[PDB]
Design a protein around this ligand. Structure first.
Ligand SMILES: [K+]
Ligand SMILES: [K+]
Ligand SMILES: [K+]
Ligand SMILES: [Mg+2]
Ligand SMILES: [Mg+2]
Ligand SMILES: [Mg+2]
Ligand SMILES: [Mg+2]
Ligand SMILES: [Mg+2]
Ligand SMILES: [Mg+2]
Ligand SMILES: [Mg+2]
Ligand SMILES: [Mg+2]
Ligand SMILES: [Mg+2]
Ligand SMILES: [Mg+2]
Ligand SMILES: [Mg+2]
Ligand SMILES: [Mg+2]
Lengths: 75, 47, 101, 116, 128, 127, 99, 48, 90
RNA sequence: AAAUCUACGGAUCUACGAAGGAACGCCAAAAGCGAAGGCAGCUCUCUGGGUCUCUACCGACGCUGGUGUGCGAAAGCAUGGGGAGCGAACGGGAUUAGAUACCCUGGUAGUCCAUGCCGUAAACGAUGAGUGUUCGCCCUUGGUCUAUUCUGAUCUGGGGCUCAGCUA
């Protein structure tokens, strides 16, 4: 991902590059790079733990948004 | 049974009450993230 | 069955070479008792990367498509195109009812 | 709105060579051959699922598969064994139900008799 | 007959425990109709109706909440006319309430009538 | 406890055997027993009207139309769709082709809308 | 109700101090649809009749302890109508004894 | 008779496919018209 | 957002319609997920298979890290005009 | 924390080119398929099974199954190839009171392909196969019908929560 800098504003170019590396999904894959080898029997365990964490976050965000949207829209 | 089946042949008696229609309008994919909705609840809703 | 043969010629191959190779494949089909229903060309295309051969790297190519009704064994003896020097890539696919263009 | 092929005269020899059975796949050939062998063994005119019809189709499928199937492919030879045992079950049914149909099937398809 | 008979009886008990009003049984049999007639006479079901009994049968039964368990035997059980009461004292769980339904030359009877008629046969099942 | 039965039967069985003293509410419960209703097979039938298909399009027909509930009226004054469906049920009631009945109901609804509009115009005239 | 004789202590303004009933009630009339209190459970534990208005989504555990169910949606008009019938019936009974 | 009604409509559908293939046969390629049609396709050179 | 429908995808998805298939790659050259287009699982399977076939045929990039962004119709060469700049500011 | 190792015979780094082997990122997963073991780049050939619809055929032809037969992760064995990366055994450097280990550096058999052998696993849902019945709610794979522009219904497998019921 290449970003041109205009008028010598390096901070704007770096922010644009960071956001584009974010929204292209390449930051997720660049953090998902492994240093060692993991077997499939450990990939299953890590995926299960990921799923449990995701379910807990879904419940938290559901309850938070419900109690926000009850109050905010005239109630 | 007799009377309720009679009164179905009348005006619109199957009208949703205000509370049920308001909950339907309250409800109408996924949600906002926790770190986003918490920032919204940290900035606003303190009144 | 009904096949589409897609060929990607090198950018420097000229009209006589294109006609010679397409006529050779057509004569193959006629010898193996097939029907040629549609020949068409997409002109010069742009590739997503540089295709690398013995001569160098190429970034544009000429696309040809031939529609045929031939034997099921047609792809087994279309394997002489892998060793062809006017070709970049070749691919025989089954026919799909999708408009192209 | 008229397409271009509605002007020129059609070609008869090309549409004749279009449908030559060297241009069709093995599944289409098998469908045609099974539809042929159904009609010899049907009892009624609409009959397509009686026991001797199923036995004739299963014998054709077994004779095709036993030659075509690769030795290293073990996932389809299980289906072939399933075909063999279903044919045995249908013959066992016919031997006590209809002796005429049992004798007709054995004589025409060239199989042997087993009471075991 | 024993598999479908036990099937319909367990359907009846399972729907009794849910507090329902009607049950539908399919496939049916004449033995099953006679068993249901015995249940109606003893007062464990209110009514039963048989529909299309010579092509594809279905039976509708109306329930009232009075039957505790119905069993049909899945094996052969002979009984003579003088073994009925001793067999009944060991078949029913309470040894007082419930009826053993046997099949006889005189028809499909319960255990109290077959003592009076002095005829034995095959035990079909019991309800209590 | 481990007794069986509901409140009235359990209490009656308890006070018959001199286990507990008689509560005060026992006589009122005996004079006015709780209600009973027959068995129901657990099935609820979805209530439907014959005018339902004509009500349907009536939101497409005369597109969105009247609303007499936000305008809190009463649960007896019909709601446009209801009167349109009643007219076409009794209209088609007399043989009349279905689409022709829809046309002649549509025309009279639009004539009613023109009548309402000129009523509002004369309201502004005497205002 | 199950502990109506426990001591109370004065602390502050609080939510105000209130003791239990001196006399055990003979009937409990409930207007709880959100099930905020344990009154049905305590009355079932202490064998007291309960008159309450039942929702379509009432649990079986709470429903089976209700002696006199009144199936309705507790709107303001129906709550008024219910209480009006109760009050008129009670005062008409009270007048028959000269009171 | 219901089987006969279904068997005709399936035979009806198969035949009209062959007729449409027959009237579409006028644009196929003869071996004596191979090179002419190749050159004419190269002249046309449709878009991507 | 851009409106795409499962029926539209099932009619247009082919490895020769590179212009239509370029909707479903990011600037890193990787494939868009299903949840941010709303199409069905069959549509996503067809899209992924056709983009893979086009990548093997050479019409689409395997990855665009270290190269320019892929848009349809122009070259993927690394010419001298990729890094044109300005000097009049200094 | 270091050392062995490697590098002035020019290493690491940077651009282009060549060779060779193995595995197929994004899609992507409480998804899908298979009797189980298992199965992931793409195109073609051949083949096994499954689901839906029918005012189509046939007519109980079904279920389970000792003795038997077949399939069966990985490691291992025999013959012939291949060998990038990883890596039992083994060499060296450290750590320690000792260190036949954990850590570092090299690295053979093996992992890969063709043809055969063995027939075992925490081969696990620690839950044999099959049949009938039992209140619901929320998702989802593949279909079909109806739609009234957004939805309802009915099959098919996969998941989350629960009335009863059961449970030390
Ligand atoms: K299956
Ligand atoms: K079997
Ligand atoms: K649970
Ligand atoms: Mg499965
Ligand atoms: Mg191995
Ligand atoms: Mg070897
Ligand atoms: Mg090591
Ligand atoms: Mg050592
Ligand atoms: Mg090494
Ligand atoms: Mg074992
Ligand atoms: Mg396993
Ligand atoms: Mg077993
Ligand atoms: Mg579905
Ligand atoms: Mg299901
Ligand atoms: Mg419980």
């Amino acid at each position: 991902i290449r970003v041109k800098v205009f008028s010598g504003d390096l901070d704007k170019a770096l922010t644009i590059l960071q956001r584009k590396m974010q929204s292209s999904g390449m930051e997720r894959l660049i953090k998902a790079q492994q240093t060692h080898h993991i077997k499939n029997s450990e990939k299953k365990v890590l995926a299960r733990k990921n799923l449990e964490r995701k379910i807990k976050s879904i419940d938290f965000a559901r309850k938070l948004q419900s109690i926000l949207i009850k109050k905010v829209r005239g109630l | 049974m007799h009377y309720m089946g009679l009164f179905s042949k009348a005006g619109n008696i199957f009208r949703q009450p205000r509370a049920m229609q308001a909950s339907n309008a309250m409800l109408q994919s996924k949600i906002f993230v926790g770190g986003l909705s918490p920032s919204t609840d940290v900035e606003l809703l303190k009144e | 069955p009904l096949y589409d043969c897609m060929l990607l010629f090198k950018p420097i191959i000229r009209k006589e070479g294109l006609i010679d190779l397409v006529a050779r494949i057509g004569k193959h089909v006629y010898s193996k008792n097939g029907v040629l229903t549609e020949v068409k060309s997409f002109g010069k295309v742009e590739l997503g990367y540089g295709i690398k051969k013995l001569d160098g790297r190429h970034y544009q190519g000429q696309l040809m498509q031939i529609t045929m009704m031939a034997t099921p064994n047609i792809n087994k003896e279309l394997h002489y195109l892998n060793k062809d020097d006017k070709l970049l890539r070749w691919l025989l696919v089954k026919h799909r009812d999708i408009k192209i263009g | 709105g008229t397409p271009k092929y509605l002007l020129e005269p059609p070609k008869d020899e090309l549409v004749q060579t279009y449908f030559h059975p060297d241009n069709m796949s093995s599944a289409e050939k098998m469908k045609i051959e099974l539809a042929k062998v159904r009609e010899e063994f049907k009892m009624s005119e609409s009959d397509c699922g009686s026991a001797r019809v199923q036995v004739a189709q299963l014998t054709t499928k077994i004779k095709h598969l036993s030659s075509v199937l690769h030795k290293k492919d073990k996932h389809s030879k299980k289906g072939l064994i399933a075909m063999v045992h279903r044919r045995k079950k249908l013959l066992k049914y016919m031997r006590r139900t209809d002796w005429d149909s049992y004798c007709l099937s054995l004589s025409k398809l060239g199989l042997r008799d087993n009471p075991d | 007959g024993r598999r479908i008979l036990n099937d319909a009886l367990r359907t009846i008990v399972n729907a009794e425990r849910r507090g329902k009003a009607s049950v539908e049984l399919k496939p049916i049999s004449t033995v099953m109709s006679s068993f249901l007639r015995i249940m109606k006479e003893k007062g464990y079901i209110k009514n039963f109706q048989v529909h299309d009994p010579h092509r594809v049968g279905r039976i509708t039964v109306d329930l009232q909440g009075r039957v505790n368990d119905c069993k049909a035997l899945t094996y052969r059980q002979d009984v003579k006319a003088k073994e009925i009461e001793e067999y009944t004292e060991r078949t029913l769980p309470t040894r007082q309430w419930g009826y053993v339904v046997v099949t006889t030359p005189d028809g499909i009877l319960d255990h109290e009538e077959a003592i009076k008629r002095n005829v034995g046969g095959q035990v079909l099942g019991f309800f209590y | 406890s481990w007794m069986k039965g509901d409140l009235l039967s359990k209490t009656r069985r308890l006070v018959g055997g001199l286990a507990t003293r008689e509560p005060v509410w026992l006589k009122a419960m005996e004079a006015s027993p709780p209600p009973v209703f027959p068995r129901s097979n657990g099935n609820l039938k979805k209530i439907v009207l014959p005018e339902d298909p004509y009500v349907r399009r009536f939101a497409r027909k005369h597109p969105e139309a009247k609303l007499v509930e936000p305008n809190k009226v009463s649960a007896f004054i019909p709601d446009p769709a209801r009167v349109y469906g009643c007219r076409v049920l009794e209209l088609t009631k007399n043989g009349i082709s279905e689409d022709d009945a829809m046309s002649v109901a549509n025309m009279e609804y639009l004539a009613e809308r023109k009548e309402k509009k000129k009523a509002y115009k004369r309201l502004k005239e005497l205002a | 109700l199950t502990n109506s004789y426990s001591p109370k202590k004065f602390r502050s303004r609080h939510k105000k101090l209130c003791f239990g009933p001196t006399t055990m009630p003979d009937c409990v009339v409930v207007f709880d649809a959100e099930r905020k209190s344990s009154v049905v459970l305590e009355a079932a534990k202490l064998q007291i009749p309960v008159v309450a208005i039942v929702d379509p989504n009432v649990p079986l555990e709470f429903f089976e302890k209700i002696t006199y169910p009144v199936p309705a949606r507790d709107s303001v008009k129906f709550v008024y109508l219910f209480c009006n019938v109760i009050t008129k019936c009670f005062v008409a009974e009270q007048m028959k004894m000269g009171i | 008779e219901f089987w006969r009604m279904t068997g005709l409509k399936r035979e009806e559908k198969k035949k009209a496919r062959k007729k449409l293939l027959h009237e579409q046969s006028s644009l196929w390629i003869e071996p004596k018209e191979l090179e002419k049609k190749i050159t004419e396709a190269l002249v046309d050179s449709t878009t991507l | 957002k851009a409106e795409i429908t499962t029926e539209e995808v099932l009619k247009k998805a082919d490895f020769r319609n590179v212009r239509f298939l370029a909707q479903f790659i990011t600037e890193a050259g990787i494939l868009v997920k299903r949840k941010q287009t709303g199409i069905s699982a069959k549509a996503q399977r067809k899209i992924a298979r056709e983009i893979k076939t086009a990548r093997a045929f050479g019409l689409m990039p395997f990855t665009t890290m270290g190269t320019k962004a892929f848009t349809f119709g122009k070259t993927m060469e690394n010419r001298d005009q990729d890094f044109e700049y300005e000097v009049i500011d200094d």
